[PDB]
Design a protein around this ligand. Structure first.
Ligand SMILES: [Cl-]
Ligand code: NA
Ligand code: NA
Ligand SMILES: [Zn+2]
Length: 159
């Protein structure tokens, strides 16, 4: 697996020759199995906004999230067969990562998937059989997170 530099629109081994290594943002540590575990894992600088209708949305708060920042991995149940992400395993077979159980998943389950290219600020991709989201532009405080599939990820899933 090779990381993609959003700034250069090129791939690299482990360190971009012009921007350096990938920058990863850690989830807030929360023990698995506890109530509302997923929402509590939200990194500092982000907020899970739950409404009275039971729906959730996620926003940047406090400081800009720079383009290229990586979030994840997406957590949940992994199996061969509303919150399901496909991965292509080492044996060229599909596996599904399911964030349905809020006690086992992480905050990324609440990220809204949007096909509107104007609002997208995250791109989903696979690295080492896990799903990550990378900021495809700077995300300013108050901006809602909106994810779509990276081109490489869509090309990978067609196999
Ligand atoms: Cl990918
Ligand atoms: Na932030
Ligand atoms: Na959501
Ligand atoms: Zn670069």
């Amino acid at each position: 697996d090779f990381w993609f530099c959003e700034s250069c629109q090129e791939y690299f081994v482990d360190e971009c020759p012009n921007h350096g290594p990938p920058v990863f943002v850690s989830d807030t540590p929360v023990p698995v199995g506890i109530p509302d575990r997923a929402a509590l894992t939200i990194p500092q600088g982000m907020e899970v906004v739950k409404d009275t209708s039971g729906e959730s949305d996620v926003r940047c708060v406090n400081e800009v999230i720079p383009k290229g920042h990586i979030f994840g991995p997406y957590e949940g149940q992994i199996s061969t067969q509303f919150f399901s992400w496909l991965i292509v395993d080492k044996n060229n077979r599909y596996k599904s990562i399911d964030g349905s159980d809020e006690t086992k998943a992480n905050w990324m389950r609440y990220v809204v998937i949007s096909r509107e290219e104007r609002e997208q600020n995250l791109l989903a991709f696979q690295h080492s059989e896990r799903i990550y989201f990378r900021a495809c532009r700077d995300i300013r405080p108050g901006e809602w997170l909106r994810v779509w599939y990276s081109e490489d990820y869509m090309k990978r899933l067609h196999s």
